[PDB]
Subunit: 441 residues, 3 copies
């Protein structure tokens, strides 16, 4: 879609809009199972060697489940427990008879829904029947001939089928029974798509999930659960996207300082509310660590667990940081160091002191030299930006940028009553302290 950007010279910040939301709001828990089997010449020795790998993988996973499974403004977030729902389901599976309900449900099929004893309705999947393979092809060789008649084409095939159990067990072993993202050994591409289609969700969610399998995997958990009655079962916890196609925008901020000659006499100010914003249910979901969100074209995948829910008036800070309805968050300092923030469609440059700051093009080199202050350049005709010894490549996606001129608000502050070293502050709090200092003077 249309991605557009606006740079606010007055506050050294830029907003990228045109994105659409896909917010993980909930969890779907599915129970994936693998049916187990309970149990010389060159080719048989390889079968016994592979069968040993199988026996020890089972013993390994049994040992691993002795315990129940577990695992600027970011400091404002709450603290969730990401696998609480999957662990709850996995707890129900240890209740007696519960494992047998699943074993029975998938006797004649590989996909089935099971209502568990506490009422939970979960999709169930038998992805590998080692029970049947071992019990139909390897058992005859090991007992009827007394380890005599065998062919190497079954050795090859057994290694293939056993490999996935060996890899699932490897992942759980280096991860204490909880893995994320969910690999293709836990759930192949075909199985996951099939799982998504049989999921009880909207057609929009199914299309969205199927066209972004790779993101679904990164937002999912595999929780190793139980081995009981020749059934190996792990819970796969999949994201529920309850907010889809609402507007999102990305706020980029950079330090705004005065540019006086005498070093140390300068005051700085930085908008601290940078991160991803998405309209959500009459409020705005604010993600202060924009690295928690994944962007695919103009779709942005975030997790509400790493969000604050803010009044929509928080948007007014971009056009009017002095607006009377939301108290815009800033931090203050006297550290006027140079840096750049690469935005979606351009680059913000905070250039101070003796720093060389330029913007270049691929074939012609330097096309703009920044003066001291906070400035911006759009990615049209620019390929790189240089601040000091640091070269930044700019994003080269299509979209129009608008440069909104305005006097930098740092000019409105008297440096001799300016409160420096304020981090979790706001426009009004800074004024509150300035008036108190001006009172005592």
């Amino acid at each position: 879609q249309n991605i557009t950007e606006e740079f606010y010279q007055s506050t050294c910040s830029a907003v990228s809009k045109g994105y659409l939301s896909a917010l993980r709001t909930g969890w779907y828990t599915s129970v994936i199972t693998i049916e187990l089997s309970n149990i010389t010449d060159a080719k048989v020795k390889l079968i016994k060697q592979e069968l040993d790998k199988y026996k020890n993988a089972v013993t390994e996973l049994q040992l691993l489940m002795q315990s129940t499974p577990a695992t600027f403004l970011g400091f404002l977030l709450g603290v969730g427990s990401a696998i609480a729902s999957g662990v709850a389901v996995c707890k129900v599976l240890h209740l007696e008879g519960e494992v047998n309900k699943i074993k029975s449900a998938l006797l004649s099929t590989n996909k089935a829904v099971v209502s568990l004893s506490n009422g939970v309705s979960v999709l169930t999947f038998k992805v590998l029947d080692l029970k049947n393979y071992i019990d139909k092809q390897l058992l005859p060789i090991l007992n009827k001939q007394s380890c005599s008649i065998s062919n190497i084409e079954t050795v090859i095939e057994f290694q293939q089928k056993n490999n996935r159990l060996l890899e699932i067990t490897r992942e759980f072993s280096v991860n204490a029974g909880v893995t994320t993202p969910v690999s293709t050994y836990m759930l192949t591409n075909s199985e996951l798509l099939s799982l998504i289609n049989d999921m009880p969700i909207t057609n929009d969610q199914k299309k969205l999930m199927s066209n972004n399998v790779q993101i679904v995997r990164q937002q999912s958990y595999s929780i190793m659960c139980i081995i009981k009655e020749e059934v190996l079962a792990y819970v796969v916890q999949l994201p529920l996207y309850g907010v889809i196609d609402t507007p999102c925008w990305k706020l980029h901020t950079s330090p705004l300082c005065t540019t006086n000659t005498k070093e140390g006499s300068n005051i700085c100010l930085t908008r601290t509310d940078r991160g991803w914003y998405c309209d959500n249910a009459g409020s705005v979901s604010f993600f202060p660590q924009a690295e928690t969100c994944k962007v695919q074209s103009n779709r942005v995948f975030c997790d509400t667990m790493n969000s604050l829910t803010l009044p929509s008036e928080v948007n007014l800070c971009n056009v009017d940081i002095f607006n009377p309805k939301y108290d815009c968050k800033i931090m203050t300092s006297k550290t006027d160091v140079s840096s750049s923030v690469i935005t979606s469609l351009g680059a913000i440059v905070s250039c101070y002191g003796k720093t060389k700051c330029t913007a270049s093009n691929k074939n012609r080199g330097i096309i703009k030299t920044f003066s001291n202050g906070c400035d911006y350049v759009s990615n049209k005709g620019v390929d790189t930006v240089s601040v000091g010894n640091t070269l930044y490549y700019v994003n080269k996606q299509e979209g129009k940028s608008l440069y909104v001129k305005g006097e930098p608000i740092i000019n409105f502050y008297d440096p001799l009553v300016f409160p420096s070293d304020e981090f979790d502050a706001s426009i009004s709090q800074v004024n509150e302290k300035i008036n108190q200092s001006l009172a005592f003077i």
Copy 2:
């Protein structure tokens, strides 16, 4: 065991107790080795192809060792060097004759203790003898028949044996010779258990380590060391648990704010001493980043390298934050944003402003609507908590919660002399500033 929780309404915090400690206090360094060998039709070409994979894995690891191997209150921690002990041992192995001492010690066995030249006594393990396999089965095929007589069952078997060397080399290649956790290619489940049993430790440590192999792996390092005289050797650095079965408890904290109508007029306070606490040697080991500790049932595995050693009186902050023996750490602000902290046995809810905050059950939906302030609900009968647009699942483990009523201490502060934006502060420091402001007035 018995997990229990107490919520302190006065300070918006909760303590989970009943846990027992397993603290990594030291390191055991073992030297794992792989003995190397020094060195047409369809089946021989595959042997030569696999032999090439072997030769290049050796060349790769030789190239990789040109250099010596290397790798709220968290800011208070010191700075260790995690693989210093393994690197020290690995340095000793480059001394002349040192590699030959090991090669000799494991001539007749695969497990042996070797006292190295500087006095260090290390367990040694030969986990794969490629020297013997290549030198007994592949060498005859490549020289005696001139690449003639071969059978595919050896091609299969060679790929199996060579695979682990290829994978060990892959791990070291993407990790610059230092890996953690220690995979099952570095050390299989059988080898690690055997290593633990032959370790010079208590019977309690052996049982504890064997029943938590997956945690031992996550707290271990594999340091690629030396290739010399047909011997490949890497050091595996294993945790020493010198503190076991002492009481541990988890402190959860959340922001406590006043709830006045006029927005911006509110003051907030948050206990900053959240994290894991374990009794340790007459003091308390405090782990400010509770994500450094791993919980398995009621056992909690932590690393003393990420701890502060505090006076045990730090515990008094939970029952009496104004106690005269320890100066309880807090932070102050005026940012009254809503959030929840999911505890071990319930959920703390900091609900402010216009936020919808509720607690729900699986089948009946909303059972409690929180008013503004800091409140708590136990996981008995509750499955989810909702703060704004964020849905939290609560932990569903058994254990009793006690709600300790008390007036929120934020009510005891006059907002017009309240010092906001204090981060590394304490009860006494805040009083010190309030009295100084009250003096100048």
Copy 3:
């Protein structure tokens, strides 16, 4: 080379010098390709089974590219976009005919340079020709005999060749098309070395990169790009080391507090400018998160994207923190907790309160007991340091340490006007506040 260390008792800090730089300053983008092919008894069924794995890997990667690819003083850094350059190249490859230019260029060879339509000159590599293998050996079996004549030695060989495609696809599936470090499936050791040799760089850069392949891998990206016209192509983004062999030094800092008896009456100060420093182009490249830099012997690999460019006078803070040319950064507090910082050649110990702080040797145990204050011990004759319940191993590399005596500067401050809880501050700012407090008194 010569690694040396100096400890400044006056400021509780230590500098390690003698290192030489290797700074990633730019990016080289190469286009790696795999040529694809467009498409019963026991041995044929395995071929059809492996061929299915191939078809689905292709379908998987096609689904994955529906979207364009994306991915104390650290807070002062700017914000780059690491794969912007590779993504830009990958965008050019979707232009029509562009894929065919590459397909043509590597018809007769596997390595070739191609000037793309926008002028970019990129190295191109065909690392696997599955097109030819499938189209010469498997096609005859599946069509001419009608799935009759086949031998197991080709089944083995097909699994080998197809395996790398299956693994590349696995990596991209768990990583949303962008991986780092660059595995040996993306680019084998031989291919990467060959790529480095054909790179348009200096002989120094080629030697440096070839002798540190493992670091090059960790600083590289694999960006999954396009599948078009039987050509699979991903961009490998390799580091350009434009700064080599300049001096580097590592600054370690630890809290310096007064040691009065009455607890709570103490004031602390910590130099905040700790991290890696490298001379670079007349300025100094400062890396505040020293964990972004990788050290190999005396060579230190850093990324300028995680640096500030500072005046070289920042070095004066080590010999004279009160120097008049650079305003040295510090933080203040009243939290006198004990801890240690393990340096390159010794250990800084900040010992306060009732903490037991000692230094030990391997065979003789405790050789020094620290008194309260900030002290230092060199790694000559010392193996471990203990602060409270935390045991630290010291680095055991050769190099001389010098202990520079001096009165701790915290003694020069009157505790009753000392501004505590200052984080982004400096020597002059603290004096500025002290004089303002002394004025109002």
